[PDB]
């Protein structure tokens, strides 16, 4: 078994599929967690990025990507799985063709506003990510790829998922999508895949209690994210535990995945 996980951001694979990754390595699978939006960003940073860096507990002009890469290595080391950090710049570091920042701040609103941009610019981003994924597939030779469903409709999650779907289709590798966490605790669960792809029936895994514990310890390595993840009530793990409790109310901890298959008549 050669499992390639494709995470949009530094933390998504561990939050959503950490237990499955740790279980996979335990069973003797070769596991690799490649993160798409891990590109090394250079100053000058935008105001919106600077603000994010402060929310992550960093100085505005700190090398934030380096810090987050280090956290990611620690967390994946904890699950006993390998890492690979991609070249793509996260949303807060990207500029548009016209020279504007992709993301700007508004006064008095929590979530950052994304500037409108061309379908061409999205097609091109997704194309480049797909290119990188295809090469990784050639290099690593996965038997299975797992990536995000993009529940919550984060644009970087959709870009990652879509590129993985195009690349895995061309390369004939089976692909599964994980339920995005903690997004799925806050957002419905229905997603729109690119034309020609659809979701098969869900599978909610059964993991040993010790893999649950390892997952949550791995999550704790993302120190920069604890404020963003614990939110208001400081109860991320409670919410994660409660979610898994529902989806197996006669079992313990587990993670929801769906296989991706071709639609009929496509």
DSSP bridge pairs for 103: 114
Q: Is 156 in the site for Zn ion (CB under 5 A)?
A: yes
Six-digit token string for 181: 């966490």
How far does the chain reach from its first CA to its final CA, in angstroms? 29
The one segment of 18-26, 93-101, 117-125, 214-222 that binds Zn ion by CB under 5 A = 117-125
Among 29, 47, 58, 122, binds Zn ion (CB under 5 A): 122
* C-beta of 73 vs 171, nearer to Zn ion: 73
Q: What is the size of the binding site for Zn ion (CB under 5 A)?
A: 9
Q: Is 180 in the site for Zn ion (CB under 5 A)?
A: no
Among 5, 8, 52, 224, binds Zn ion (CB under 5 A): 8
Binding track, positions 72-91, relative to Zn ion; x by CB under 5 A: ------------------xx
Six-digit token string for 260: 């991706």
Distance CA(237)–CA(49), nearest Å, equals 27
Among 9, 161, 215, 239, binds Zn ion (CB under 5 A): 9
In sequence order, what are the residues at sequence separation of 6 or more whose Cβ sits closer than 8 angstroms to the Cβ of residue 152? 180, 183, 184, 186, 187
Distance CA(256)–CA(248), nearest Å, equals 10
| Smallest separation (angstroms) from Zn ion to the CB of 139 | 15
Contact 65, 40 (CB under 8 A): yes
Q: Is 241 in the site for Zn ion (CB under 5 A)?
A: no
9 is in an annotated binding site: yes
Place of tokens 């080391």: 77
Positions touching Zn ion (CB under 5 A) are 8-9, 12, 37, 90-91, 122, 156, 184
């Amino acid at each position: 078994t050669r499992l390639l996980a494709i995470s949009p951001h530094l933390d998504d694979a561990v939050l959503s599929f950490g237990a499955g990754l740790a279980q996979a390595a335990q069973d003797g699978a070769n596991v690799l967690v490649y993160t798409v939006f891990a590109g090394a960003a250079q100053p000058p940073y935008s105001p919106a990025a600077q603000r994010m860096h402060t929310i992550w507990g960093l100085a505005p002009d700190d090398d934030a990507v380096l810090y987050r890469r280090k956290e990611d290595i620690a967390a994946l080391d904890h699950l006993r799985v390998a890492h690979r950090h991609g070249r793509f710049l996260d949303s807060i570091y990207r500029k548009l063709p016209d020279g504007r920042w992709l993301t700007a701040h508004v006064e008095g609103r929590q979530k950052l506003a994304v500037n409108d941009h061309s379908p061409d610019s999205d097609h091109d981003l997704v194309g480049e990510v797909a290119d990188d994924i295809r090469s990784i597939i050639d290099e690593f030779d996965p038997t299975l790829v797992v990536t995000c469903a993009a529940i919550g409709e984060h644009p970087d999650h959709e870009a990652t998922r879509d590129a993985a779907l195009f690349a895995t289709h061309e390369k004939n590798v089976p692909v599964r999508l994980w339920e995005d966490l903690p997004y799925a605790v806050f957002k419905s669960g229905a997603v729109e895949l690119p034309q020609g792809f659809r979701l098969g029936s869900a599978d909610v895994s059964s993991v040993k209690p010790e893999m649950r514990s390892q997952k949550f310890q791995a999550v704790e390595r993302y120190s920069s994210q604890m404020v963003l993840l614990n939110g208001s009530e400081n109860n991320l793990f409670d919410r994660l535990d409660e979610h898994a409790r529902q989806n197996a109310p006669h079992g313990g901890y587990g993670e929801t995945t769906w296989p991706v298959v071709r639609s009929d008549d496509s």
